[PDB]
Structures are given as structure tokens and as C-alpha cells.
Design a protein around this ligand. Structure first.
Ligand SMILES: O=C(O)[C@@H]1CCCCCC[C@@H]1NS(=O)(=O)N1CCCC1
Length: 358
């Protein structure tokens, strides 16, 4: 890599790893469209396995960007409409609070207070139906944003229903394979387990547990190389040959709602570039990112703005990830770690790197 990129990345990430006691980390910088890779530390402390460019990390909520794009692709295919009522794809959802709740509301956390987590008690499909039937909204649809796995998770499950494919099969054939993300998985195959990093929580090696709607809300594992390719694809969707996928990427970066200085896409979240770093850094703390906040509808949604800071944080019990990119500058970053360390530390490091390069 250019010594500029090397010095900028190392001077930022080295203190971050020491301050946060991160066992292993991989970083990709996309600069003028090309990726540059950096790795540190251990994928498996006990077996002394280093992080490499082939190490798989749990993406956590960064998975929601894949779900948003897969949904965008289903829209582009004409299989679903974001204006469709939820009940069009789940007719068994007969309880009256669902009147007026559309797929858009599910995709953007604005259905009226769906909870952050699906209860652990829920497992079978009938458990899930019962949960949603019994759920009582605190707010009318489209008035408040409350970040929720039970919201975008249901969107992902419903979005693939007309295709007849399972969510995993749809993701594989319509997103992963066209983009040549050949080391990106919802379920890690036995052949790839050698590369699956352990996560570390209170010093214990952990992997994400199965849960309802896990594939759709937090289920993807990927390498730093595939994630850099994911950033490149979202930076320049028009270079993608599959038409509905190119269109779906664009739909996921449209601005549907505004709260404060941030705009809600499908999975992706966006701010106008240049950004106030304190806005994205402090805004990434869970104190703000998970709070109930009033939203203004963007009527109609703004198409993908090239002069945006587009990003998503993600975590599981043992992992912490961040992706941010600026289409106007052909500039982006992926940070994958096998510890869940605080969101503001992620965004601060990413902004330092990208600001120095733009
Ligand atoms: O990634 C995140 O940013 C979310 C933030 C929501 C509140 C904190 C928990 C972390 C969470 N991860 S998760 O919701 O995707 N998923 C839940 C079970 C395992 C991982």
C-alpha cells in the first residue's frame, strides 16, 4: 500500500487495538476504488491462529445491509413493493394493529415499536406468528424509529416469500454469487471452519447462538476481502451487471426517514458528506442508536446521494464490525474485530482514516 495509507491506518488502529484489548482485527481501506488490507492479532487465541485475509468474522448487524440490498433486489424484480401491507405476504397476521404497517415500516424500524430482540422464547414458526399477533405498538406507523431485529428481520423473511426461495438460498443466488462473495456465509460450511475466528466476550471464546430471524438480522459471516468487495459494490453499483441487483443497491441507499442528522436506508444509514465527526461518532453510541426517536418522512424518498457518509455498525456477543464509505470520493473502510468494543471507538477510528485520505 502507499505509505500514506499504511501510516494513516497503523497510527490509528495500533492504539485502538491496545486501548480496547482487541484480540484480532482486519481492516480494508478502499482508496480510489482499490482495496488495501491490514491484519493484526489472533483469530483463535488458544490455537494460536492469526487473523488473515481469509479469516471469517461475525458481522452482526452489518448483516442488515445485505438484507436491505436483497430486499431492494426483490423490489427491482417486481416481487414486492415497499408500499405493500405486511399482511399481503403474511395473511395469517390478522390482528388489527397491523392495518397500515407496510414493508417499508418493517425495513426501516418505523412500524411503531417492534422490539430490539425477538424473545428467546420464540423458536417455531407458530411461536413467531403468536409473537407478532400479540405485539402492541406504542406508536402509530411511520412516526417513531426504534432500531429492531424483529422489524428488519421480518422484512427480510417476507421479502423473499414470492421468490419461493429460502432466505439463505435467495441471499446466495441473488447477492453473494453475482458479486463473487465466495467466502461469505449465513451458515459456515465445515470446509471453511478452519477460517472461522472465535469471538471473545469476557475472555471466553464464543460464537453467535441460533435465534429467530437470525439469518435476516445478524447472521452473516465474511472475510475482509469479501467485505471490501461488498463496499466496492455499494460504492459503484452501476458497474454491476445484474440489473435488479444494481437497482437494489441503489434502493438500499435511498433516504426514507430523517432523525436528527441521519437518514434511514434499507439496512444502510446515511449522513450528508462532509459530516460533523462528533455527529457520527456520538450518534453511533447505543445511547442514541438504539433510542426511540421521532422521524420525518422523506416524501418521496431521496435517491442515493453520492455526497453521503454511508455506514453501519454491527456486533455480536463476541464481535464488533463497522463499514463506512463515501461514494463521491470512491472511499471506504471495513473494520472487523473479534471483540464487541464500543461503537464510538469504531467510528472515531474510521473517520480519522477516511478524513486523512479524502
Ligand atoms: O449489532 C448491533 O449493533 C446490535 C445493537 C443492538 C443492541 C446491542 C446488541 C448488539 C446487536 N447485535 S445484533 O442485534 O445484531 N445481534 C443480537 C444477538 C447477537 C447479535
Amino acid at each position: 500500500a502507499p505509505q500514506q495509507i499504511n501510516d494513516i491506518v497503523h497510527r490509528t488502529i495500533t492504539p485502538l487495538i491496545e486501548q480496547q484489548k482487541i484480540p484480532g482485527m482486519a481492516v480494508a481501506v478502499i482508496y480510489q476504488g482499490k482495496p488495501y488490507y491490514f491484519t493484526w492479532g489472533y483469530a483463535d487465541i488458544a490455537k494460536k491462529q492469526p487473523v488473515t485475509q481469509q479469516t471469517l468474522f461475525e458481522l452482526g448487524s452489518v448483516s442488515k445491509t445485505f438484507t436491505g440490498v436483497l430486499g431492494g433486489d426483490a423490489i427491482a424484480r417486481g416481487e414486492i413493493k415497499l408500499s405493500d401491507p405486511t399482511t399481503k405476504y403474511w395473511p395469517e397476521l390478522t390482528a388489527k394493529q397491523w392495518n397500515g404497517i407496510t414493508l417499508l415500516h418493517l425495513a426501516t424500524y418505523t412500524a411503531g415499536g417492534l422490539p430490539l430482540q425477538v424473545p428467546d422464547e420464540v423458536k417455531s414458526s407458530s411461536d413467531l406468528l403468536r409473537f407478532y399477533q400479540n405485539w402492541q405498538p406504542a406508536w402509530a406507523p411511520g412516526t417513531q424509529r426504534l432500531y429492531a431485529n424483529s422489524s428488519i428481520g421480518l422484512f427480510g423473511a417476507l421479502a423473499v416469500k414470492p421468490s419461493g426461495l429460502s432466505f439463505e438460498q435467495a441471499m446466495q443466488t441473488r447477492v453473494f454469487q453475482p458479486l463473487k462473495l465466495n467466502h461469505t456465509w449465513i451458515n459456515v460450511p465445515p470446509a471453511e471452519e478452519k477460517n472461522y475466528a472465535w469471538g471473545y466476550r469476557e475472555g471466553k471464546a464464543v460464537h453467535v447462538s441460533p435465534g429467530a430471524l437470525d439469518a435476516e438480522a445478524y447472521g452473516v459471516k465474511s472475510t475482509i476481502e469479501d467485505m471490501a468487495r461488498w463496499v466496492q459494490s455499494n460504492l459503484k453499483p452501476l458497474d454491476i451487471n445484474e440489473k435488479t441487483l444494481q437497482q437494489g443497491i441503489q434502493l438500499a441507499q435511498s433516504r426514507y426517514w430523517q432523525t436528527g442528522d441521519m437518514y434511514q436506508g434499507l439496512g444502510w444509514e446515511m449522513l450528508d458528506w462532509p459530516v460533523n465527526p462528533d455527529s457520527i461518532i456520538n450518534g453511533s453510541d447505543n445511547k442514541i442508536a438504539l433510542a426511540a426517536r421521532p422521524v420525518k418522512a422523506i416524501t418521496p424518498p431521496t435517491p442515493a446521494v453520492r455526497a453521503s457518509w454511508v455506514h453501519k455498525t454491527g456486533a455480536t456477543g463476541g464481535f464488533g464490525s463497522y463499514v463506512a464509505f463515501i461514494p463521491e470520493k470512491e472511499l471506504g473502510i471495513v473494520m472487523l474485530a473479534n471483540k464487541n468494543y464500543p461503537n464510538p471507538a469504531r467510528v472515531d477510528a474510521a473517520w480519522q482514516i477516511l478524513n486523512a485520505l479524502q
